[PDB]
Scaffold this motif. Structure first.
Motif, short mmCIF file in Angstrom:
data_model
loop_
_atom_site.label_atom_id
_atom_site.label_comp_id
_atom_site.label_asym_id
_atom_site.label_seq_id
_atom_site.Cartn_x
_atom_site.Cartn_y
_atom_site.Cartn_z
N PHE A 162 53.50 60.94 49.49
CA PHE A 162 53.47 59.49 49.43
C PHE A 162 53.72 58.88 50.81
O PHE A 162 53.05 57.92 51.21
N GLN A 163 54.68 59.45 51.55
CA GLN A 163 54.98 58.95 52.90
C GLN A 163 53.84 59.17 53.92
O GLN A 163 53.71 58.39 54.87
N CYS A 164 53.05 60.21 53.71
CA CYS A 164 51.94 60.56 54.61
C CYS A 164 50.76 59.61 54.47
O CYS A 164 49.89 59.55 55.35
N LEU A 165 50.73 58.88 53.37
CA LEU A 165 49.63 57.99 53.10
C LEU A 165 49.80 56.70 53.85
O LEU A 165 50.90 56.35 54.28
N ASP A 166 48.69 55.97 53.97
CA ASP A 166 48.66 54.67 54.61
C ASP A 166 49.02 53.59 53.58
O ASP A 166 48.27 53.40 52.63
N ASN A 167 50.14 52.88 53.76
CA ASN A 167 50.57 51.90 52.77
C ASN A 167 49.59 50.76 52.58
O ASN A 167 49.58 50.11 51.56
N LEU B 165 51.27 56.29 61.41
CA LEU B 165 51.80 54.96 61.08
C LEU B 165 51.17 54.37 59.83
O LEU B 165 50.12 54.82 59.37
N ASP B 166 51.85 53.37 59.27
CA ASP B 166 51.35 52.60 58.14
C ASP B 166 50.57 51.41 58.68
O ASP B 166 51.15 50.56 59.36
N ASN B 167 49.28 51.35 58.36
CA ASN B 167 48.38 50.36 58.95
C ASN B 167 48.67 48.98 58.44
O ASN B 167 48.31 47.94 59.00
CA CA Z 1 52.84 56.32 55.50
#
Ligand code: CA
Ligand code: R77
Ligand code: R77
Ligand code: MN
Ligand code: MN
Lengths: 410, 410
Positions: A162-167, B165-167
């Motif tokens: 979940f953390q590796c994904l792009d929010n 990073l979170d985009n």
């Molecule tokens: Ca992330």
């Protein structure tokens, strides 16, 4: 301010949650602990109430309800709503002053409190993997009805993913929703495993291993059930199905990899083949905290990862001959229908039998296999209440079936 | 469709960009190559134009402008705008049909073309780390003035960082902006390095290494200049400063770590101490592709990372005694002002002297040190045109100082 309820607050997940909340609040006041729910540890609940002063206290065991009320009178300037049982749990879930609920309870009461959290449109930090594996269909249906409810994974590997994904993309979907992987550009998952205490045993050594042997892990102290699951790698089997349901990832796109150092917690391969991973020391505070801060992060005073000191990270494929439970899990997931429910239930019995020295290591996979062989797929109920009942019935059938197979071989 | 211009299309970065664009376009029609700009290689440009059929062609060298017009007549249903020199480059930057520009040009035409891309509010995929190191102040000012312009990093480690990073948060800021780290909740960066060919060498062995020794990199065949920089670890020194500018990360929060397998490309530690990293085989196609697809990803047919086969990843601290260039870079960065400009310029000279067997390994850092010792901070021009001239003057002075030191000594 993040308003949080902790279900199972004296258990491993619960205590870790309270520890990291305490430490983070020392840095900056971010969390209000609004509710604590425990089973029977009334003294500890009182000690926790003294510190966190939650609006709600709930104790499952009615026989210490009166004792809790008396204890709480010692606390200066404090007048909580004090509740009991399943209905105290529902009342906490219905409160408007609660935004997020940590589910740190196992089995029924885990699924049950999860259901109520979702029906009340809450953010649900779910640490109970068995509920996802067993009742994935029901959770999916419920989340489709309650559109503002969200499950956020707490299981360390699933938190890592979940953390590796792009929010930016995550916010356009949610866990357990169809097309989650497509929207997030996920191609494949590496699910990292400690490998458990038996990872380097020969087949001959495995035949004779006992639970006492297992209840000495190479990395961590945990509950007995998960330690046994780590030893047989059924834990990772369950986590494969959990990945499938949470993230809508196909089974042939989930690879279990043994990473004995437990620094990389899992990895995600995107459609361009770039791989992103999450890393930290073995510590559940990170996954628990993230479930409560997502989609933001807050400061902690946890020890920084010293990669140079760690120095070396290793990866290898698990042997399916040595850990046949992994194979059974994949077979059950790929089969679909309620096979995962059966896998979970039959494992519950087999794990406990091995724990209590009634069967040997390979009898675990043997019993689970025979119960899976035995099951016949069923029409999935369209009604959410009927579906829940159907899951419970299959769960109970599978436990009884496992027990009967044991009794046959005595 | 992603409308892209490639500046320097026959160099290393430019050819890699066209290769990955070709391969991705076979899978899905995603990219329109709208412009190609090359220096003198008019035949190769013709070959590219034949394949990619861009709306614009530009060749820098006016002497072959006519040869280019003639060559393209061979292309059947094709009516390109054919341009030349700086004015063609500017005309391309000003086109409303061009969204992103890959700058695969070194030294100052690189900077000059970047400047115009920024002035035209384009997305700039920048591979020239020397320009960020040397002219960071100028790029920062220019990006503050041109609010819709963006630099996207292509250097593999900075791409890795950017991918972690979170985009979600990235879209609230942009690279080379104050507060980038705060907004993205970044605490610290691990910048991963191959370590080059000399990691195990003693101080006495380092005294006598030659450029022929250096030009056999353990992992990648690359240009001579960067190969020497990888050997001295001045490459990482430059990349530390690049990190500081791109991501507004304090120097004390950037750690260089030697990772000889070159699978993990860099790592980002967030304020909660969770670490996220990007991984893949050594390959520049992923960083280039991501600069063009960000904030999305597209499918490729690149070989999937096989972690079990990779098997082992290692990490250790670089010895600053053995690689004094790393220390000089931090010192220059921490000093600030135009010290990074001086570092870059003096290294340009020292690197080339070593490459041509005129000095020894430790003379590289000795010369760079003495040039830095000789520089004094200057008031930073407020005016962007004055600032650019200041940078050029300092760069030129530093090259001359390095050269005069060499000449004294010889
Ligand atoms: Ca992330
Ligand atoms: C933690 N977690 O999510 C688990 O399922 C327990 C681990 C065994 C403990 C590994 C050590 C550890 C890693 C991360 C966080 C805490 C502990 C199961 P496995 O790696 O053996 O499959
Ligand atoms: C690639 N890149 O960004 C570089 O600065 C070149 C590397 C040396 C080549 C390492 C192998 C490699 C990694 C990633 C992509 C291509 C090649 C410099 P360093 O690791 O020696 O500091
Ligand atoms: Mn787990
Ligand atoms: Mn690099």
């Amino acid at each position: 301010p993040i308003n949080v309820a902790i279900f199972g607050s004296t258990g491993s997940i619960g205590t870790n949650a309270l520890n990291i909340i305490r430490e983070c609040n020392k840095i900056e006041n971010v969390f209000n602990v609004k509710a604590l729910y425990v089973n029977k540890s009334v003294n500890e609940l009182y000690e926790q109430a003294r510190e966190f002063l939650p609006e709600y206290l709930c104790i499952h065991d009615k026989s210490v309800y009166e004792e809790l009320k008396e204890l709480v009178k010692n606390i200066k300037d404090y007048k909580p709503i004090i509740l009991c049982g399943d209905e105290g749990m529902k009342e906490i879930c219905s409160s408007n002053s609660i935004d997020k609920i940590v589910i740190g309870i196992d089995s029924f009461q885990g699924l049950y409190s999860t259901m109520y959290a979702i029906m009340n449109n809450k953010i649900v930090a779910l640490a109970n993997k068995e509920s996802i594996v067993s009742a994935g269909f029901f959770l999916k249906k419920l989340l489709n009805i309650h559109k503002n409810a969200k499950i956020i994974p707490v299981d360390s590997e699933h938190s890592a993913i979940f953390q590796c994904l792009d929010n930016n993309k995550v916010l356009k979907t949610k866990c357990l929703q169809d097309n989650f992987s497509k929207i997030n550009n996920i191609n494949k998952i590496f699910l990292c495993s400690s490998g458990g205490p038996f990872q380097n045993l020969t087949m001959d050594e495995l035949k004779n291993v006992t639970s006492e042997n297992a209840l000495k892990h190479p990395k961590w102290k945990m509950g007995k059930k998960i330690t046994i699951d780590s030893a047989t790698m059924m834990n990772k089997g369950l986590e494969v199905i959990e990945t499938h349901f949470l993230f809508d990832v196909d089974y042939n796109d989930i690879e279990v990899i043994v990473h004995k150092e437990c620094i990389i917690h899992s990895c995600v391969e995107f459609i361009d083949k770039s791989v992103i991973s999450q890393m930290y020391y073995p510590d559940m505070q990170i996954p628990i905290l993230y479930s409560l801060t997502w989609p933001d992060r807050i400061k902690t005073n946890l020890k920084p990862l010293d990669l140079a000191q760690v120095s070396t990270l290793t990866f290898h494929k698990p042997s399916l001959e040595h850990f046949p439970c992994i194979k059974l899990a994949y077979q059950a997931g790929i089969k679909g229908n309620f096979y995962p429910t059966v896998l979970n239930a039959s494992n519950e019995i087999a794990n406990n039998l091995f724990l209590n020295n009634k069967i040997k290591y390979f009898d675990i996979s043997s019993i689970i296999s025979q119960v899976l062989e035995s099951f016949n797929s069923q029409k999935v109920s369209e009604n959410s209440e009927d579906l829940m009942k159907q899951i419970l019935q299959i769960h109970s059938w599978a436990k009884d079936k496992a027990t009967d197979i044991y009794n046959k071989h005595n």
